[PDB]
Design a protein around this ligand. Structure first.
Ligand SMILES: [Ca+2]
Ligand SMILES: [Ca+2]
Ligand SMILES: [Ca+2]
Ligand SMILES: [Ca+2]
Ligand SMILES: [Mn+2]
Ligand SMILES: [Mn+2]
Ligand SMILES: [Mn+2]
Ligand SMILES: [Mn+2]
Lengths: 237, 237, 237, 237
């Protein structure tokens, strides 16, 4: 039902469904089986940063993930989003845990989209930036186990009182306002997203990951999408 | 019921309710009877621009209106918005006509709000800019007679096929996402709004005006607020 | 001597040096003989807009040129600017006329460059926007025949009192501050430039064109670069 | 000679020249004897943040300084900068030490100035943001003992190898490009500056302070302005 385009930070290798045998970043177009992936040297307990960029002229979705003092990981995929997504969409973050677990903490999130028309100086834009989340964040649609306010952070999946991450959890956060990514008179459409995250697990095998995604405006968590499905897909096809 | 703070571009002098005897700009705090006004040399048929600014440190709401090749008009009022408005609000534009009429056309509208916390680099922001409006503008809540899409503009009040403005009309447009204007750990909160408009009337006496406003998130057009009430207030108290 | 990367809006076809037989937009890497070009339906006397974009992840320089009510023209070229340009550069606009002529008027110009480091939230940026130019624009380095202030515009090449464009003219405008386009710890570097222009000629054959360019910081107009050389190259190799 | 407007973070009370008897923030208009001050609970060794704002409509220069987990300090002063400063100016940071000392480390610095003209959509802007400084920062004019690059920070005054601050030191950093703060057709001019700093001293009595300042473009450090004069004034009048 839902149309999903996402950049996944996959912490657990499910080789039975196409994941490489190591943590990786990937670009998912309507399927959890990434169209392209790159090895990611994930660091348990460290704050990392992900940057996602795209523009309608080049038609290439690219993402870069890094941690301080370390080399980055990058992945790119040629795709025309006009042919995949509706004209109006919502953007958000999703995460899940299953048998294995980890905290999926978001410390900041910014997004900027621009539509440049052929009229002189005619440019439409939307920009939001969160460097702190409140208990009652009215401009976010929280789904599943996601909550905001703990230490000013956004916890996508369940975490107990003692800070311990729970398994079989799924949660998403979408920006309240729909986003216009295509318009008939637009000559250039582009967006850039950045978010900082903290994945921590008491185990040697963290799971399952975090994903930045773009979807139809009325998207909701598919049934049974905990674990390897990242709260984004109904199955592994 | 609704809590309204607005900057009015009042084209018709209703001296019976406190308006000066000439077109004017004014700052309205919960009442159509402006707390402060300034003479405005309105130009029928010309595109004008309004700028509104405010910050929590100075606690002064100021507005400047101008037309190309002409001197500007300015008005300021000392007011602490924390004591007037809720923590979360919606921002929008409103306009009305009555016995007398005019077109209340909006050609562009931008808004920027920032909340700077005491945490290092911790800053929250929201920014939107419309330089063109679509027939189906999903990020705007249109109320009353307001419509978008005609020539890429936002028509706040009714206009016939031949471009002729109708009387007894009222319409408003609010940005879809709620806006956070106060937070317990914020050291500075501020906003700036800019919109360009085209007020045109076939008559020597245009009415009633356009207003930029901030209100509780669930605000709706009060009954009988056409004409002198600008689609904002239930009465003239 | 100078290292030049430029996007040319070439109005005169010099087929003897590789130009296609029609006005065109092209990407020039250290040579006036464009690495790639696209047909451009230039409109004499109309205000057009050019958008240039690039990022270090995709390594693709793309440009889009358009006029109101018309289809756009686009050109892209895969090039790693790190391998062509110095770490610090200046950005500017250049134009020329020769035997044939045209006005090379710039009405607005904006530029944004960003360097995102691997440190958390660590981002460096520079942004400038001119929608009007003054007689004494201290933040611009004017070279050759370029002047600012006439009607608030930037005239890159000589125009007489009666508004008539002169031949054999060359002029450039560079932003005063050097721009940092590469840094050892940067994970993503990108820039976007936009400018609106008005090319008008009394003749059926306008020449020679306008170019947005990036160069070493101490770049100056090469001798004899009027005409087909666009004020950028010392010869046609 | 120089014309200086500055916001001082004064760490040492020189009661003989008008300082209150405690660390304080103040607004200086052409004199080290602040026109207005506010008590500042300075924290040795902690990273603080200063925000400075001003606009031509309200004509009020305000500043807010804070540290994480602490209440802020604010100071405001009504002043028309058009009557004090030239049309073109440079903005920068200055610091000094004398008999007493401290490190005057700047970790980030951002600035935004805007000039809104009465022409439709006509807006000029300049924005820069440094979250990291390089050894060779070509867009900064360093004066005196100021250096960049150590740990990616800007050290305004001398610090030895072991990280120990030196006395009798003075240094300033100015952004390379001049800034336009007034224009004949501007209806609103405004600026906002933010910088984060780390003042650390091995002594119970740190000195002398850091100041954000605006000056004539060719400003240089006055002779003998170490110590209480903050590298800004030639004497204490
Ligand atoms: Ca997986
Ligand atoms: Ca009235
Ligand atoms: Ca040519
Ligand atoms: Ca002192
Ligand atoms: Mn995967
Ligand atoms: Mn009124
Ligand atoms: Mn060519
Ligand atoms: Mn003092």
């Amino acid at each position: 039902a839902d149309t999903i385009v996402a950049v996944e930070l996959d912490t657990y290798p499910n080789t039975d469904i196409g994941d490489p045998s190591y943590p990786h970043i990937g670009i998912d177009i309507k399927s959890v089986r990434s169209k392209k992936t790159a090895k990611w040297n994930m660091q348990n307990g460290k704050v990392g940063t992900a940057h996602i960029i795209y523009n309608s002229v080049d038609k290439r979705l690219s993402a870069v993930v890094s941690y301080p003092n370390a080399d980055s990981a990058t992945v790119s995929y040629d795709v025309d989003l006009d042919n995949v997504l509706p004209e109006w969409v919502r953007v958000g973050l999703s995460a899940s845990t299953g048998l294995y677990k980890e905290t999926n903490t978001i410390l900041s999130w910014s997004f900027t989209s621009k539509l440049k028309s052929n009229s002189t100086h005619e440019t439409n834009a939307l920009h939001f930036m969160f460097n702190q989340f409140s208990k009652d964040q009215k401009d976010l649609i929280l789904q599943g186990d996601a909550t905001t306010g703990t230490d000013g952070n956004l916890e996508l999946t369940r975490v107990s009182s003692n800070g311990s991450p729970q398994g079989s959890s799924v949660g998403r956060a979408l920006f309240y306002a729909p986003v216009h990514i295509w318009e008939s008179s637009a000559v250039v459409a582009s967006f850039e997203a950045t978010f900082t995250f903290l994945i921590k697990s008491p185990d040697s095998h963290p799971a399952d990951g975090i994903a930045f995604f773009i979807s139809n405006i009325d998207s909701s968590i598919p049934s049974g999408s905990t674990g390897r499905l990242l709260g984004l897909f109904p199955d592994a096809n």
